[PDB]
């Protein structure tokens, strides 16, 4: 569902974005991502899911997209 | 930066199967050729690979 607008940097990349999806249970979230010049794009994330009856409140997330 | 193998050199290109030539049976004749072609023997003693010293000539003076 949720992606952020155009954000990046010169030798870096700032990104601001929220999170949902059509999809596993419901996926409510928000986070960011940072890119190194060549390969790695990654950031941090907070989440909120819906496990069956009730809803999952918390989830933190690491990321590492190491293209190669 | 995925190639260091053929950089320090190795005796890989060595011991490649030397070249023989076909020979035409009767009637027909093998086609004439030209182009990419080994130079004549011109024997020397320039060693192979690590047995040779790829080093910059001295001064040059």
């Amino acid at each position: 569902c949720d992606v952020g607008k155009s954000f990046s940097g010169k030798d870096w990349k700032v990104t601001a974005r929220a999170g949902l999806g059509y999809q596993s249970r419901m996926l409510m979230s928000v986070g960011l991502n940072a890119e190194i010049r060549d390969n790695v794009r990654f950031g941090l994330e907070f989440e909120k899911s819906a496990f069956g009856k009730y809803n999952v409140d918390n989830a933190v997330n690491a990321n590492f997209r190491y293209s190669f | 930066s995925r190639y260091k193998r053929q950089v320090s050199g190795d005796e890989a290109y060595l011991e490649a199967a030397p070249l023989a030539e076909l020979h035409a049976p009767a009637g027909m004749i093998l086609p004439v050729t030209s182009g990419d072609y080994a130079i004549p023997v011109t024997n020397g003693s320039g060693a192979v690979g690590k047995a040779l010293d790829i080093r910059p000539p001295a001064q040059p003076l």
């Binding site: 069956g52 997330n61 690491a62 990321n63 190491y66 | -």
Partner: protein, 765 residues
């Protein structure tokens, strides 16, 4: 009179290269001509311009001023890739470690200034700065203080009587207003794009009969602060027109009957432009079929304004044969050759089919491995008939690595890995791993697939997995489950529309912590065991050798915002004997589009789904393979899966509930009538689309003993259908393709629910 040379410390050039044109040649007496000659030589070489040469005795100095050289670059730029500027500066005559004279300052200055002008930033100031470093060196200090955007203001038109300006713009690229909520096109200035806009507008006129239409001018004004640009266009709408036959004429090597048949038309009908385009291209296509390589189609009109009718001429010619001799490749440094061949539609040693090579290039690009694919058709020396295409490609890295870590309140410490490798060893194959576990799930899998098991397109794919759901929401359904297994498959196109895939497989499941409810109990009773139905510490194992087979389809006109075509589907299974749960099932889907209008803005939509699943040896199909229905996917209004029967919990007499349980008999259909936006302006009224709808649905058991449980809503009733109706939007957001939906189910049954609102994302299925 002078013989000695002078060169006061050349320090960078050869001395003979400076004595080339010196008039102090040996044995050559020197005069005022010597002064003229040495001045002209020192200036012609242009390396250095200092000189002090006169008629003075035996000595004669020819001095030199050495402002070079420079090796440094200073910026400067703020929102442009510096290395691109480096390239452009190379294209001007300068580069690191090289001589440089101030005649280049204004050159590069205005070069980059006009560059920024082209980009639209019509305000900038590039400062050339050099600082003497020892005896030759300087720095290259460029600062870039520039304007901002110079954005558009309005795009008006004069003389458009037939239509209005709004719908005309629409179509355009350089939109006027970027709404805060329907961003589909964003506004800048691209001098080059104005041309494309002009052309698409002219075409838009030429596809209605306005033959004599022509633009006649164009102004791009500018406000005196370089913030808002204006743009205007003038036209002459002329009138409509008609046709009278088509008059193909030329040398066609025959080759006429199919031509004429390929060109028939209804007289007295409105001239069309795009139809003429399609027809001439189809002539080109037939020629390519017969073998010729480079045809030609030219259509000048021949107008009778008085008759409001034009007799359209067509003059064509074939050309020659142009055989292809050897199709090479350039670039595939880590991707095996045999790949880049099988993706082709032009076999070496044949006649060259232009469209074939282009369809190739298209395919190749679509393969995804590469990033940049360009062609060529160079000719062989000597022969006038043979050529040999080559393909310039530059691949990019393919495989990827992932890693993530987390932890939650209702979720343990997260873990996440996997080596997604796309083009393994550049050998067509594909391989990846995955993994995730907080507390309740332990998903992991393995991937192996070869898209070319045969030389034709017959794919092949493997799979292994592990699945250990561990839910403990004490008493809803929460049947704890560990399960894993593997399977292989096939798949192969037949008509670039249809497809088949018939996979084998194997799966082993482990039920655990079952709860008391009759349906599952029934299944078990038919499985041989006899669980004491008053305690929920339960478990069960199984193994079955499955079998898959399916068939797909697509005929949609477009891929985005469909309007006409279809999408059918099918999938069935069967437990091969030797298994332990003899069952089988069949699904079925269908999408259908019919444009009730000829301008393709009023379309109906018809969806349907079906299903059936039954056991064989009096063994009910295991409940962990049951159908469902209800939700913003197939049956609007309700919640997800709300439809269908409900469990019956044993007492620890009986009772009921409302939590859905599903079953094995699905059926659902729907209808829609697309309709435009009757409110918003047509500046962007094409990027929102909606309809009305009136849906259906139903789900029921097949083995329910409807006799004993008469104090309960019967479930062998296959007729309990629940219908709904409403409207729903669809338009791309700054966030993603969204589909709002607000209906209100008029009908229902008991235990069901209603969910008035429906917010989804990208129902691009």
């Amino acid at each position: 009179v002078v013989k000695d040379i002078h060169f006061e410390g050349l320090q960078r050039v050869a001395v003979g290269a400076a004595l080339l044109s010196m008039p102090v040649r040996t044995g050559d007496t020197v005069n005022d001509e010597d002064i003229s000659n040495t001045i002209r030589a020192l200036f012609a070489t242009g390396n250095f311009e200092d000189v002090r040469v006169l008629r003075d005795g035996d000595t004669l100095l020819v001095q030199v001023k050495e402002r070079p050289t420079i090796a440094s670059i200073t910026f400067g730029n703020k929102s442009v890739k510096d290395d691109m500027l480096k390239q452009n500066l190379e294209a001007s005559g300068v580069r690191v470690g090289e001589s440089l004279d101030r005649t280049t300052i204004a050159d590069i200055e205005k070069g980059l200034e006009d560059f920024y002008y082209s980009v639209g930033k019509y305000s900038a100031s590039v400062k050339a700065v050099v600082t003497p470093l020892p005896r030759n060196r300087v720095d290259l200090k460029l600062v870039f203080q520039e304007g901002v955007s110079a954005e558009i203001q309005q795009i008006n038109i004069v003389g458009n009587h037939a239509f209005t300006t709004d719908e005309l713009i629409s179509h355009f690229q350089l939109r006027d207003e970027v709404p805060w909520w329907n961003v589909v096109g964003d506004r800048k200035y691209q001098k080059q794009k104005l041309a494309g806009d002009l052309e698409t507008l002219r075409s838009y006129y030429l596809d209605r009969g306005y033959a004599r239409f022509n633009i006649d001018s164009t102004q791009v004004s500018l406000t005196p602060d370089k913030k808002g640009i204006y743009v205007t266009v003038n036209i002459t709408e002329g009138d409509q027109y008609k046709l009278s036959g088509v008059e193909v004429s030329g040398n066609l090597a025959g080759h006429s009957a199919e031509i004429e048949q390929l060109t028939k038309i209804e007289p007295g009908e409105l001239y069309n432009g795009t139809k003429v385009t399609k027809m001439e291209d189809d002539i080109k296509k037939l020629l390519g079929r017969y073998g010729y390589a480079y045809p030609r189609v030219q259509s000048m009109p021949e107008i009778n304004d008085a008759d409001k009718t034009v007799k359209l001429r067509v003059n064509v010619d074939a050309g020659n044969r142009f055989y292809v001799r050897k199709i090479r490749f350039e670039g595939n440094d880590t991707s095996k050759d045999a790949v880049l061949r099988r993706e082709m539609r032009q076999m070496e040693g044949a006649w060259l089919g232009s469209d074939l090579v282009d369809q190739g290039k298209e395919r190749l690009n679509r393969l995804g491995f590469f990033e940049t694919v360009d062609t060529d058709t160079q000719r062989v020396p000597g022969s006038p008939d043979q050529v040999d295409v080559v393909y310039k490609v530059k691949e990019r890295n393919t495989g990827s690595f992932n890693f993530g870590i987390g932890y939650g309140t209702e979720s343990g410490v997260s873990f996440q890995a996997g080596v997604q490798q796309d083009n393994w060893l550049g050998t067509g194959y594909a391989v990846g791993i995955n993994g995730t576990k907080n507390d309740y799930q332990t998903y992991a899998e393995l991937s192996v697939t070869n898209p070319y098991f045969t030389v034709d397109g017959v794919s092949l794919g493997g799979r292994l997995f592990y699945n250990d759901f561990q839910a403990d929401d004490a008493d809803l359904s929460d049947y704890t489950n560990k399960s894993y297994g593997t399977d292989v498959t096939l798949g192969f196109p037949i008509n670039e529309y249809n497809s088949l895939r018939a996979g084998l497989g194997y799966v082993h499941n482990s039920l655990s912590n079952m709860q008391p409810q009759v349906a599952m109990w029934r299944y078990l009773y038919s499985m041989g065991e006899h669980p004491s139905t008053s305690d929920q510490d339960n478990s069960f194992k199984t193994d079955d050798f499955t079998f898959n087979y399916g068939w797909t389809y697509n005929k949609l006109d477009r891929g985005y915002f469909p309007t006409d075509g279809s999408r059918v589907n099918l999938t069935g299974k069967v437990t091969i004997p030797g298994s332990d749960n003899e069952y089988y099932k069949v699904t079925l889907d269908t999408a259908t589009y019919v444009p009730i209008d000829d301008d393709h803005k009023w379309v109906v939509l018809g969806r349907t789904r079906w299903g059936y699943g039954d056991g064989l040896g009096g063994k009910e199909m295991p409940f962990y393979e049951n159908f469902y229905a209800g939700g913003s996917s197939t049956v609007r209004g309700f919640q997800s899966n709300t439809i269908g029967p409900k469990a019956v919990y044993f007492p620890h007499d009986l009772c009921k509930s409302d939590d859905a349980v599903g079953g094995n008999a699905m059926a659902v259909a729907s209808l829609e009538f697309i309709t435009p936006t009757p409110f918003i302006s047509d500046k962007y009224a094409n990027s929102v689309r909606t309809s009305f709808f009136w849906d259906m649905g139903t789900v029921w058991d097949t083995n329910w003993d409807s006799s004993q449980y008469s104090g309960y809503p019967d479930y062998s009733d296959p007729s309990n259908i629940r219908m709904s109706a409403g409207i729903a939007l669809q338009w791309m957001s700054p966030l993603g393709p969204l589909v709002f939906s607000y209906a209100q189910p008029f009908k229902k049954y008991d235990g069901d629910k209603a969910e008035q609102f429906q917010f989804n994302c990208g129902k691009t299925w």
